[PDB]
Design an enzyme around this catalytic site. Structure first.
Site, PDB file in Angstrom:
ATOM      1  N   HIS A 157       0.089   3.557   1.506  1.00 59.20           N
ATOM      2  CA  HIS A 157      -0.103   2.109   1.643  1.00 59.20           C
ATOM      3  C   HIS A 157       1.205   1.347   1.800  1.00 59.20           C
ATOM      4  CE1 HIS A 157       0.334   1.100  -2.727  1.00 59.20           C
ATOM      5  NE2 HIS A 157       0.779  -0.027  -2.173  1.00 59.20           N
TER       6      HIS A 157
ATOM      7  N   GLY B  86       5.481  -4.104  -5.916  1.00 56.78           N
ATOM      8  CA  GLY B  86       6.856  -3.587  -5.712  1.00 56.78           C
ATOM      9  C   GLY B  86       7.078  -2.231  -6.369  1.00 56.78           C
TER      10      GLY B  86
ATOM     11  N   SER C 198       4.695   0.081  -6.219  1.00 57.31           N
ATOM     12  CA  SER C 198       3.935   1.024  -5.358  1.00 57.31           C
ATOM     13  C   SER C 198       4.843   2.046  -4.698  1.00 57.31           C
ATOM     14  CB  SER C 198       3.076   0.239  -4.375  1.00 57.31           C
ATOM     15  OG  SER C 198       1.978  -0.375  -5.053  1.00 57.31           O
ATOM     16  N   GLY C 199       4.347   3.294  -4.626  1.00 55.38           N
ATOM     17  CA  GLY C 199       5.032   4.417  -4.033  1.00 55.38           C
ATOM     18  C   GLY C 199       5.884   5.204  -5.032  1.00 55.38           C
TER      19      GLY C 199
ATOM     20  N   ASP D  88      -3.764   8.232  -1.377  1.00 52.32           N
ATOM     21  CA  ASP D  88      -2.632   7.363  -1.052  1.00 52.32           C
ATOM     22  C   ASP D  88      -1.254   7.973  -1.154  1.00 52.32           C
ATOM     23  OD1 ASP D  88      -1.292   5.099  -0.466  1.00 52.32           O
ATOM     24  OD2 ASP D  88      -1.703   4.142  -2.384  1.00 52.32           O
TER      25      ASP D  88
END
EC number: 3.4.21.1
Lengths: 237, 237
Positions: free
Chosen positions: B52, B185, B187-188, B97
């Protein structure tokens, strides 16, 4: 641009479109053939979509579909040469949500595949104006095979803040809250307004109600705040 | 892998980390230098992040930062050779994801830059287990310069459904609802669990409360359901 050969006759609460009537509408598909986002052709070599769609060169641009479950349409699966995400894009706030896709090979314009117009940065899209949004996102928060459309009104940023507050930025334009809703899978797709007989891309399906509530305003990338970049990007590549 | 040279000493409600203590934590930055997502180094040539995040070859992987506002850290801004989005990824449901980033040039492992371990597909990460999440996302739904961390418990899918229902899929693992929240922020970024003295990546910061509510479970990509693909992808490239 913006004048379909097959005239459109007037998403949750939408309606099935007349096949090939939104010629610029494309579908972003993964290696798997899964449609994850919409797009709009601006010319034979470029597609405009949402930066949040997170498209890569491994995804494909599909043009000319109506029924995604069908094997009988003359469609164009185009390879993507490169992804141009607007550097102004802010994923945290979903602001300036736009990406340009440069095709490896040019689309073959036809009756069912053509370009939408882009407005001037100074253009005014008044609150109350009725536009149309198209796409294959959920019709029920429930995924359609056949392309849906819905007419819906533009809201002013001020009125939209009433629902979304500080989430609405200058590069955003609200639409809906009218009994229809753009939904998961609609993102990257077009929000077009008809004038002097042609359709201009005023918005890019961006974000909205977590449940695609039809009484809540949909948020789209305001193309007038991004068109200078589109033009700069095409000019340079 | 998974053993930091600079030992970590134990995001909304987090705490500032000891500089260089989460050596695998990288920052995904746009052309502009804007941090939009976290990542984890798995080796000198590969970074694991969330699909994402929508990373492109125009974004850069940054390694070795602690203070993003600082000009005095020996950091590594690495070019991305290519983006490998898991074909199982479903953006509509934010399922599976995960994306692998292959660096154009290998990171130089140091004391402040190293790899996190990856688990076996069969590994069990029990509900109740306390893990750690790190990142530079909002500390208040409010963006930090310095890397934050937070200890938080794993939940079982069943219990998580209580809050999120059918949104939780097999390729998801819930964490939090503990007084801390991963936020925009983050995310990942990594969700790591310590065992037999090393940190294993059990989750990838994926999604959660629209307001980063600290009483709501955070959702992360369940690395055990994705590690076979990671291995398949590295093996082939």
């Amino acid at each position: 641009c913006g004048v379909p050969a097959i005239q459109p006759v007037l998403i949750v609460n939408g309606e099935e479109a007349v096949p090939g009537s939104w010629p610029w509408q494309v579908s972003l598909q993964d290696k798997t053939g899964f449609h994850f986002c919409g797009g709009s052709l601006i010319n034979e070599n470029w597609v405009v979509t949402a930066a949040h769609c997170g498209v890569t060169t491994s995804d494909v641009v599909v043009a000319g579909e109506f029924d995604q479950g069908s094997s009988s349409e003359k469609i164009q699966k185009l390879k993507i040469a490169k992804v141009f995400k607007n550097s102004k894009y802010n994923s945290l706030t979903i602001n300036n949500d736009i990406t340009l896709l440069k095709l490896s090979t040019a689309a073959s314009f036809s009756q069912t595949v053509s370009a939408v117009c882009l407005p001037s940065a100074s253009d005014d899209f008044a609150a109350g104006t009725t536009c149309v949004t198209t796409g294959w996102g959920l019709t029920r928060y429930n995924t359609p095979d056949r392309l849906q459309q819905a007419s819906l009104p533009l809201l002013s940023n001020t009125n939209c803040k009433k629902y979304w507050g500080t989430k609405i930025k200058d590069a955003m334009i609200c639409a809906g809250a009218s009994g229809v809703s753009s939904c998961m899978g609609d993102s990257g797709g077009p929000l077009v307004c008809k004038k002097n007989g042609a359709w201009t891309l005023v918005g890019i399906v961006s974000w909205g109600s977590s449940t695609c509530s039809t009484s809540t305003p949909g948020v789209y990338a305001r193309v007038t705040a991004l068109v200078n970049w589109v033009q700069q990007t095409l000019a340079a590549n």
